[PDB]
């Protein structure tokens, strides 16, 4: 099929830029370039607590690196040491005024990227690939959502021929704009290859 990326589809209306800020035609590249390496370093030494929406804001030497996480208890350590040394390594290679505004997540089950990375990991840890998707979608709908959808793809378990396991419930009108459906991609390293993950959570309306 096709199915253009739902996020790029709601880009204008529903959800706004995962990275919001202005730039002149002079250095847009260099700005977004460093803006990129930032979020990459975060995805690395921060995935522990399970980060998702790495929001960013810039204008002039100011950069609000708001990082949404399932449990900030790990991103801060104790009193203020983990978070502090994080701002350290941040501006350590950069030059802008780093300002890590951490924020919790009301419910990881209703946060698609988390839901994905979650189950995607279960597969890496060798688990029931079929029912893992079943519980995941059951977790989200029973949680409080109004629509759910999860899809893995690749060598399920380790079979030669490829395969794709479809599973979902509720509604997921991907063709509609006023839906506010969070997208949740995720990798999955296996001793036998790669493995794709998808996750759709319908929530908002009007």
């Amino acid at each position: 099929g096709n199915k253009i990326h739902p996020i790029g589809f709601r880009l204008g209306i529903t959800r706004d830029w995962e990275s919001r800020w202005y730039a002149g035609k002079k250095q847009y590249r260099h700005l977004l370039l460093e803006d990129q390496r930032i979020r990459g370093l975060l995805e690395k030494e921060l995935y522990s607590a399970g980060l998702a929406r790495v929001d960013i804001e810039r204008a002039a030497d100011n950069v609000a690196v708001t990082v949404h996480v399932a449990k900030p208890g790990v991103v801060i350590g104790r009193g203020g040491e983990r978070i502090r040394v994080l701002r350290e390594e941040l501006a350590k290679l950069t030059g802008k005024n780093v300002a890590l505004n951490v924020q919790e997540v009301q419910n990881p089950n209703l946060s698609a990227p988390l839901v994905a990375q979650r189950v995607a990991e279960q597969i890496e840890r060798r688990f029931a690939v079929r029912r893992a998707i079943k519980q995941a979608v059951q977790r989200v709908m029973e949680s409080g959502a109004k629509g759910a959808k999860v899809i893995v793809s690749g060598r399920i378990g380790g079979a030669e021929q490829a395969r794709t396991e479809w599973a979902a419930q509720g509604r997921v009108p991907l063709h509609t704009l006023r839906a506010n459906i969070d997208y949740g991609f995720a990798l999955a390293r296996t001793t036998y290859g790669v493995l794709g993950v998808k996750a759709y959570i319908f929530l908002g309306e009007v």
């Binding site: 990326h5 790029g8 880009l11 959800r15 830029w17 800020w21 847009y28 590249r29 977004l32 990129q36």
Partner: protein, 60 residues
């Protein structure tokens, strides 16, 4: 020669007519926009993600 070339692209030892464009993200050799400094591929990838500020889906 993929790794040694992305490094040589940033070298510019001799004359300027060797400092050819080179995508930053996936380090593509062609289709590199100068404005973004990216290849057409990774460009679209990010655009769907929303990591490209002001870059909205064109419709007219």
């Amino acid at each position: 020669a993929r790794k040694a070339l992305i490094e040589k692209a940033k070298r510019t030892p001799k004359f300027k007519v060797r400092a050819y464009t080179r995508c930053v993200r996936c380090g593509r050799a062609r289709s590199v926009y100068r404005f973004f400094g990216l290849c057409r591929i990774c460009l679209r990838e990010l655009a769907h993600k929303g990591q490209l500020p002001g870059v909205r889906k064109a419709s007219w």
